[PDB]
Scaffold this motif. Structure first.
Motif, PDB file in Angstrom:
ATOM      1  N   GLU D  28       2.624 -47.266  41.878  1.00 48.05           N
ATOM      2  CA  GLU D  28       3.256 -48.574  42.022  1.00 48.05           C
ATOM      3  C   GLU D  28       4.398 -48.596  43.028  1.00 48.05           C
ATOM      4  O   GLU D  28       4.415 -49.436  43.932  1.00 48.05           O
ATOM      5  CB  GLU D  28       3.769 -49.045  40.661  1.00 48.05           C
ATOM      6  CG  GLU D  28       4.389 -50.427  40.658  1.00 48.05           C
ATOM      7  CD  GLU D  28       3.373 -51.529  40.861  1.00 48.05           C
ATOM      8  OE1 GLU D  28       2.184 -51.317  40.540  1.00 48.05           O
ATOM      9  OE2 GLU D  28       3.766 -52.620  41.321  1.00 48.05           O
ATOM     10  N   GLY D  29       5.359 -47.692  42.883  1.00 45.61           N
ATOM     11  CA  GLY D  29       6.316 -47.516  43.952  1.00 45.61           C
ATOM     12  C   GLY D  29       6.348 -46.094  44.464  1.00 45.61           C
ATOM     13  O   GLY D  29       6.878 -45.200  43.799  1.00 45.61           O
ATOM     14  N   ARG D  30       5.808 -45.888  45.663  1.00 43.38           N
ATOM     15  CA  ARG D  30       5.840 -44.624  46.387  1.00 43.38           C
ATOM     16  C   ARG D  30       6.157 -44.929  47.845  1.00 43.38           C
ATOM     17  O   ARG D  30       6.312 -46.089  48.234  1.00 43.38           O
ATOM     18  CB  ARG D  30       4.511 -43.860  46.273  1.00 43.38           C
ATOM     19  CG  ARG D  30       4.075 -43.513  44.859  1.00 43.38           C
ATOM     20  CD  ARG D  30       5.051 -42.560  44.204  1.00 43.38           C
ATOM     21  NE  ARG D  30       4.681 -42.271  42.821  1.00 43.38           N
ATOM     22  CZ  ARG D  30       3.960 -41.219  42.456  1.00 43.38           C
ATOM     23  NH1 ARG D  30       3.560 -40.355  43.370  1.00 43.38           N
ATOM     24  NH2 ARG D  30       3.656 -41.012  41.182  1.00 43.38           N
ATOM     25  N   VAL D  31       6.242 -43.889  48.667  1.00 40.49           N
ATOM     26  CA  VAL D  31       6.504 -44.038  50.093  1.00 40.49           C
ATOM     27  C   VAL D  31       5.277 -43.553  50.848  1.00 40.49           C
ATOM     28  O   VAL D  31       4.763 -42.464  50.572  1.00 40.49           O
ATOM     29  CB  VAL D  31       7.765 -43.272  50.531  1.00 40.49           C
ATOM     30  CG1 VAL D  31       7.983 -43.396  52.034  1.00 40.49           C
ATOM     31  CG2 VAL D  31       8.978 -43.781  49.783  1.00 40.49           C
ATOM     32  N   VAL D  32       4.809 -44.359  51.796  1.00 34.86           N
ATOM     33  CA  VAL D  32       3.552 -44.127  52.494  1.00 34.86           C
ATOM     34  C   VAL D  32       3.817 -44.127  53.993  1.00 34.86           C
ATOM     35  O   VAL D  32       4.452 -45.049  54.516  1.00 34.86           O
ATOM     36  CB  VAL D  32       2.512 -45.195  52.104  1.00 34.86           C
ATOM     37  CG1 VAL D  32       1.341 -45.211  53.060  1.00 34.86           C
ATOM     38  CG2 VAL D  32       2.018 -44.939  50.688  1.00 34.86           C
ATOM     39  N   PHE D  33       3.341 -43.090  54.679  1.00 31.16           N
ATOM     40  CA  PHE D  33       3.517 -42.962  56.121  1.00 31.16           C
ATOM     41  C   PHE D  33       2.375 -43.676  56.832  1.00 31.16           C
ATOM     42  O   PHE D  33       1.214 -43.274  56.712  1.00 31.16           O
ATOM     43  CB  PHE D  33       3.578 -41.494  56.523  1.00 31.16           C
ATOM     44  CG  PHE D  33       4.775 -40.780  55.987  1.00 31.16           C
ATOM     45  CD1 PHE D  33       6.011 -40.919  56.600  1.00 31.16           C
ATOM     46  CD2 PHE D  33       4.670 -39.978  54.867  1.00 31.16           C
ATOM     47  CE1 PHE D  33       7.120 -40.264  56.106  1.00 31.16           C
ATOM     48  CE2 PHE D  33       5.775 -39.321  54.368  1.00 31.16           C
ATOM     49  CZ  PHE D  33       7.000 -39.470  54.984  1.00 31.16           C
ATOM     50  N   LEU D  34       2.700 -44.729  57.562  1.00 32.87           N
ATOM     51  CA  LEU D  34       1.661 -45.319  58.384  1.00 32.87           C
ATOM     52  C   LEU D  34       1.767 -44.801  59.812  1.00 32.87           C
ATOM     53  O   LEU D  34       2.871 -44.589  60.319  1.00 32.87           O
ATOM     54  CB  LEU D  34       1.770 -46.844  58.388  1.00 32.87           C
ATOM     55  CG  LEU D  34       1.557 -47.492  57.022  1.00 32.87           C
ATOM     56  CD1 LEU D  34       1.790 -48.992  57.090  1.00 32.87           C
ATOM     57  CD2 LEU D  34       0.168 -47.184  56.508  1.00 32.87           C
ATOM     58  N   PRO D  35       0.650 -44.561  60.485  1.00 34.59           N
ATOM     59  CA  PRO D  35       0.728 -44.146  61.891  1.00 34.59           C
ATOM     60  C   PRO D  35       1.051 -45.312  62.810  1.00 34.59           C
ATOM     61  O   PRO D  35       1.714 -45.144  63.837  1.00 34.59           O
ATOM     62  CB  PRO D  35      -0.669 -43.577  62.166  1.00 34.59           C
ATOM     63  CG  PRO D  35      -1.553 -44.273  61.196  1.00 34.59           C
ATOM     64  CD  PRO D  35      -0.725 -44.502  59.963  1.00 34.59           C
ATOM     65  N   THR D  36       0.581 -46.502  62.450  1.00 35.30           N
ATOM     66  CA  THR D  36       0.816 -47.694  63.250  1.00 35.30           C
ATOM     67  C   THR D  36       1.419 -48.805  62.408  1.00 35.30           C
ATOM     68  O   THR D  36       1.772 -48.592  61.245  1.00 35.30           O
ATOM     69  CB  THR D  36      -0.485 -48.191  63.878  1.00 35.30           C
ATOM     70  OG1 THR D  36      -1.461 -48.389  62.849  1.00 35.30           O
ATOM     71  CG2 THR D  36      -1.011 -47.209  64.906  1.00 35.30           C
ATOM     72  N   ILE D  37       1.554 -49.995  62.986  1.00 34.70           N
ATOM     73  CA  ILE D  37       1.911 -51.164  62.195  1.00 34.70           C
ATOM     74  C   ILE D  37       0.717 -52.103  62.306  1.00 34.70           C
ATOM     75  O   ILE D  37       0.868 -53.324  62.436  1.00 34.70           O
ATOM     76  CB  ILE D  37       3.222 -51.817  62.671  1.00 34.70           C
ATOM     77  CG1 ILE D  37       4.247 -50.737  62.999  1.00 34.70           C
ATOM     78  CG2 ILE D  37       3.864 -52.610  61.530  1.00 34.70           C
ATOM     79  CD1 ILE D  37       5.509 -51.230  63.683  1.00 34.70           C
ATOM     80  N   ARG D  38      -0.482 -51.527  62.331  1.00 35.75           N
ATOM     81  CA  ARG D  38      -1.689 -52.331  62.229  1.00 35.75           C
ATOM     82  C   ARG D  38      -1.772 -52.969  60.851  1.00 35.75           C
ATOM     83  O   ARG D  38      -1.312 -52.407  59.853  1.00 35.75           O
ATOM     84  CB  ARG D  38      -2.929 -51.484  62.491  1.00 35.75           C
ATOM     85  CG  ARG D  38      -3.069 -51.034  63.923  1.00 35.75           C
ATOM     86  CD  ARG D  38      -4.309 -50.189  64.084  1.00 35.75           C
ATOM     87  NE  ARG D  38      -5.517 -50.971  63.853  1.00 35.75           N
ATOM     88  CZ  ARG D  38      -6.734 -50.451  63.746  1.00 35.75           C
ATOM     89  NH1 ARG D  38      -6.910 -49.140  63.844  1.00 35.75           N
ATOM     90  NH2 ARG D  38      -7.776 -51.244  63.537  1.00 35.75           N
ATOM     91  N   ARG D  39      -2.363 -54.160  60.802  1.00 35.12           N
ATOM     92  CA  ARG D  39      -2.355 -54.939  59.572  1.00 35.12           C
ATOM     93  C   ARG D  39      -3.351 -54.409  58.545  1.00 35.12           C
ATOM     94  O   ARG D  39      -3.091 -54.491  57.338  1.00 35.12           O
ATOM     95  CB  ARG D  39      -2.636 -56.405  59.898  1.00 35.12           C
ATOM     96  CG  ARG D  39      -2.497 -57.363  58.736  1.00 35.12           C
ATOM     97  CD  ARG D  39      -2.795 -58.780  59.183  1.00 35.12           C
ATOM     98  NE  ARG D  39      -4.154 -58.908  59.703  1.00 35.12           N
ATOM     99  CZ  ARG D  39      -5.235 -59.092  58.950  1.00 35.12           C
ATOM    100  NH1 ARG D  39      -5.124 -59.177  57.631  1.00 35.12           N
ATOM    101  NH2 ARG D  39      -6.430 -59.197  59.517  1.00 35.12           N
ATOM    102  N   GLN D  40      -4.474 -53.848  58.985  1.00 34.50           N
ATOM    103  CA  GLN D  40      -5.490 -53.346  58.072  1.00 34.50           C
ATOM    104  C   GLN D  40      -5.845 -51.908  58.417  1.00 34.50           C
ATOM    105  O   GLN D  40      -6.208 -51.606  59.557  1.00 34.50           O
ATOM    106  CB  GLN D  40      -6.747 -54.215  58.108  1.00 34.50           C
ATOM    107  CG  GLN D  40      -6.557 -55.608  57.544  1.00 34.50           C
ATOM    108  CD  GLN D  40      -7.821 -56.431  57.621  1.00 34.50           C
ATOM    109  OE1 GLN D  40      -8.831 -55.985  58.162  1.00 34.50           O
ATOM    110  NE2 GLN D  40      -7.775 -57.642  57.080  1.00 34.50           N
ATOM    111  N   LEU D  41      -5.749 -51.028  57.423  1.00 39.12           N
ATOM    112  CA  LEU D  41      -6.083 -49.618  57.586  1.00 39.12           C
ATOM    113  C   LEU D  41      -6.939 -49.195  56.397  1.00 39.12           C
ATOM    114  O   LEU D  41      -7.379 -50.026  55.597  1.00 39.12           O
ATOM    115  CB  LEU D  41      -4.820 -48.756  57.705  1.00 39.12           C
ATOM    116  CG  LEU D  41      -3.909 -48.970  58.914  1.00 39.12           C
ATOM    117  CD1 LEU D  41      -2.666 -48.114  58.784  1.00 39.12           C
ATOM    118  CD2 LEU D  41      -4.634 -48.669  60.215  1.00 39.12           C
TER     119      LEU D  41
END
Lengths: 67, 291, 63, 310
Positions: D28-41
């Motif tokens: 529910e609350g964690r931290v997630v590393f995204l490579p981009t700021i793309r809207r859908q992954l």
């Protein structure tokens, strides 16, 4: 000095500088020597401003061929 | 509506001279422990910042203002003090007037950080507390003015008083108790830098001993480069051992402690609209935070 | 070139073995490289690691 | 920040073992590393398998540089079809508040900035596995910002021992004794950390610093008189034993000393390189804590309100 006039010509034409262009402008001592293994020639180089073999700044302690 | 407003209650027993000074202090920066609707004024006062026993110095006020939360007072009712916090309440409204306690003028488009009143006072008689308001001066001066006062303290063990911003004079000297109030910041500078400039000088045993201006650049550039040749350009490799690697960690934390203190982040930017660009002393300036 | 100069940094920092020892630069010719050892097209496939030692006179104590 | 904010959507693949579906609802609350700021992954983009480097599994110390190349984001709500998260470098929400569950051994206080660390500590190494999708999820540990600067300083100083053929494992905070799990460190990223040090180490040394070095005999005399100066040296610094041997003295006189201020120039160059270096090794403390119903201590295993830090 004209060396400073050289340095602007290199900097303008290359768009930059490396130490490779620094050492080529001052002087260089380019000496033939010959190899004991396979009889072929090779080159011993001492730069001018270097710390090595003959160097404008760093010769403590200089070494002798007296032995 | 949906605007957030903290309500600070004044305890009753105010004398008629005491309410007049609180009537005058309309646009000023005021810290508070936690964002909350209703709150006493005892957490606002300077007495609430103490650790003993000891009234806190310039070093502690810089440490407190990270943990304390900045707020600007709105209109002042005789019942309560209504103030809005900067970090949450302003993101919906957008515009808050703010009066300078600083003698330095403000141009348009400037970032403003907050400085404790070290540059150089309100006390209430009937309520038995003091008030100290921080100084909203611009952030490029903020890294300067702090560092000028540190440089004076090193001289305690040319003129440092010259600071000319936007065509105006400043006199840092103007005296006695300002120097001793700042003494704790001076010692953590010298202990950080000299411990910095021994460990680097122990890991590189010949930084100063290396030849001047041409070998040092050649030592710089290979260290400055990106290529894979990194570690063989650095390290020099009963009897006691220098505890260097433990002294790394204690120095990095102390250097890492002072990074949060002396950043002096741009909390406030001022956008002058329908008026003069130059905002002078004793004038309300509009405030727009980052969107 | 760049390897010719980064090695001068090695003597300055003292990482080389031997403090009374001094540094000598050498240009190996390609024809000297062929008759002694390795083929030439192998080194074509920008610095290259080379391990160097010094051997003392007539007694087997090397660096 | 937009008027509505920006919310990415991480789609879930359809093949789901039902116990792995309930495992995602605990995230529910964690931290997630995204490579981009793309809207859908996808979840494959989020998980540890794409989070590896080319052919090489990164270690703990090398995982820090992989963080700052990417975008930390926080899961808001777990849906049956997808996972909705908000980035941190982008302005985070419409309201300015996010909940963050502590997967951390240490409680939190108000106002303290949060940086985040890989799973490092012993015992509490917990990685969620999605065995229907054959995925592994390594989630970072949110911690207070002076603690994260300690742990980076403990790891980086450990790798410098490996280039030199005791001890440095034990930390302390709130009186808690805690060590950390590490076996090896790749020689690649240590050089990337070390070169980031020594360039910032050198760039603090200016002409005024040698004038400051003349005050080393003053501090060791002053630590006799005040215990507050005794709170500096701690017997483990170099400067206590350095003052016992070296008596330095000032150079004189400085070139163009009339026009310039050498002590002032040494400090400002010091504040931009050495005092900056707490940001340069780890990532930035983007987030601090502001509880609204005032809870001075956010306990380990609970959510917390979250507001950006400049």
């Amino acid at each position: 000095s004209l060396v400073e006039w050289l340095d602007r010509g290199w900097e303008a034409l290359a768009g930059g500088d490396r130490p490779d262009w620094l050492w080529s402008r001052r002087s260089i001592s380019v000496v033939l020597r010959h190899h004991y293994g396979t009889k072929q020639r090779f080159v011993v180089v001492s730069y001018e401003n270097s710390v090595a073999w003959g160097g404008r700044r760093a010769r403590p302690p200089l070494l002798s061929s007296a032995l | 509506a949906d605007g957030f407003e903290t309500d600070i209650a004044i305890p009753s027993g105010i004398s008629r001279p005491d309410a007049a000074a609180l009537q005058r202090c309309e646009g000023r920066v005021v810290f508070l422990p936690t964002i909350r609707r209703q709150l006493t004024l005892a957490d606002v006062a300077h007495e609430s910042f103490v650790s003993g026993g000891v009234s806190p110095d310039t070093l502690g006020l810089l440490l407190a203002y990270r943990r304390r939360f900045p707020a600007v007072i709105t209109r002042v009712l005789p019942t309560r003090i209504v103030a809005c916090p900067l970090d949450v309440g302003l993101t919906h409204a957008g515009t808050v007037n703010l009066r300078n306690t600083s003698p330095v003028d403000l141009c348009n488009g400037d970032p403003i950080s907050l400085v404790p009143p070290v540059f150089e006072d309100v006390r209430l008689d009937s309520l038995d507390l003091t008030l100290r308001f921080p100084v909203p001066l611009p952030s490029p001066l903020a890294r300067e003015i702090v560092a000028r006062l540190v440089a004076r303290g090193i001289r305690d063990l040319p003129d440092l008083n010259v600071l000319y911003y936007n065509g105006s004079r400043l006199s840092l000297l103007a005296l006695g108790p300002v120097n001793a109030e700042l003494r704790s910041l001076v010692l953590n500078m010298v202990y950080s830098i000299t411990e910095g400039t021994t460990i680097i000088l122990t890991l590189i045993p010949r930084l100063f001993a290396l030849s001047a201006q041409d070998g040092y650049v050649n030592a710089l550039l290979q260290m400055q480069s990106v290529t894979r040749e990194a570690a063989q350009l650095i390290h020099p490799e009963g009897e006691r051992r220098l505890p260097l690697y433990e002294a790394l960690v204690a120095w990095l934390t102390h250097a890492g402690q002072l990074g949060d203190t002396l950043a002096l982040a741009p909390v406030v930017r001022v956008c002058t609209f329908d008026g003069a660009a130059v905002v002078r002393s004793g004038d309300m300036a509009p405030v727009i935070r980052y969107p | 070139m760049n390897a010719h100069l980064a090695n001068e940094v090695q003597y300055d920092l003292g990482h080389v073995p031997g403090r009374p020892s001094s540094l000598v630069h050498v240009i190996i010719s390609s024809e000297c490289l062929a008759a002694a050892g390795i083929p030439l097209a192998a080194l074509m496939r920008a610095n290259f690691q080379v391990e160097i030692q010094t051997r003392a006179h007539a007694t087997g104590d090397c660096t």
